[PDB]
Design a protein around this ligand. Structure first.
Ligand SMILES: CC(C)CCN1c2nc(Nc3cc(F)c(O)c(F)c3)ncc2N(C)C(=O)C1C
Length: 274
């Protein structure tokens, strides 16, 4: 399952934000690295809420998903912290934070080519999961970490990684799922048991909309019931001003799950864009 990291090797520091029923901190880990060297390693510490330890199993299965596979675009898991009755996941710390908050703060000078490079790296990660038939279940700009910024000095592209999906939507209450529209596909709003490989194709289109919207959350002005109304009326997200990917967003966000393109074809269509 997971490697056990003991209490004394970890130091909890600043709170970075929240996940679903979790608190997230920047931490420091003392470890023996390569060649027996002692390392002070920055880590991420996801602490499942004391009130929500019900979801302890789903909390660790999502991390036991990125752990049993290895890929350059997947966030590394370090293990589980042993202390009290708490549930702590120890994961790779990324300096530049979420793509969600990065697209927002850098919306002014992120051009189409920057969005395209991040879009390909995300599709490449999803293509890797599709070939392994591994359902992620929570693709969004918040679960994406920016490891390297774009270097305009040498034209070096940015680099991203995809973190774990957190507690599965097949287990979360209905108020959270309806709040996650339009990231959760319409067939999962009807029934969370429809979680499938086609779910990640829909959520990829929503993330692709976030990337072209400069941090904007789709359907922010709509509440839960008007998001449920959004799906029943079979509406689609508005075309972003940076519209060179609205056709791919709408094609991925297909109300018929069996018609959403495979991430194979998504990459071809992405690569055929100047
Ligand atoms: C709650 C949100 C925001 C945490 C996002 N997040 C991560 N963030 C960071 N670095 C980070 C850097 C910052 F300068 C910062 O202000 C910040 F908040 C976070 N490293 C690893 C992750 N890993 C693995 C994750 O799964 C997730 C979800």
């Amino acid at each position: 399952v997971f490697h056990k990291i003991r209490n004394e090797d970890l130091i909890f520091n600043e709170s970075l934000g929240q996940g679903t029923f979790t608190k997230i901190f920047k931490g420091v880990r003392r470890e023996v690295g390569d060649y027996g060297q002692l390392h002070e390693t920055e880590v991420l510490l996801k602490v499942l809420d004391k009130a929500h330890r019900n979801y302890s199993e789903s909390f660790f299965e999502a991390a036991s998903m990125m752990s049993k596979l290895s890929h350059k675009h997947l966030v590394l898991n370090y293990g589980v912290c042993v202390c009290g009755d708490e549930n702590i996941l120890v994961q790779e710390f990324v300096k530049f934070g979420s793509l969600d908050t990065y697209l927002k703060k850098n919306k002014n000078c992120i051009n189409i080519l920057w969005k395209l490079e991040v879009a390909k790296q995300l599709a490449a990660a999803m293509h890797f999961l599709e070939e392994n038939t591994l359902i992620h279940g929570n693709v969004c700009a918040k679960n994406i970490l920016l490891i390297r910024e774009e270097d305009r000095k040498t034209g070096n592209p940015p680099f991203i990684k995809l973190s774990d999906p957190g507690i599965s939507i097949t287990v979360l209450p209905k108020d959270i799922l309806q709040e996650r529209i339009p990231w959760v596909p319409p067939e999962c709003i009807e029934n969370p048991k429809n979680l499938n490989l086609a779910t990640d194709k829909w959520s990829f289109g929503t993330t692709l909309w976030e990337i072209c919207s400069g941090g904007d959350k789709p359907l922010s002005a709509l509440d839960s019931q008007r998001k449920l109304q959004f799906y029943e009326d079979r509406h689609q997200l508005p075309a972003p001003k940076a519209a060179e990917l609205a056709n791919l967003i709408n094609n991925c966000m297909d109300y018929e799950p069996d018609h959403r393109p495979s991430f194979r074809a998504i990459i071809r269509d992405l690569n055929s864009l100047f």
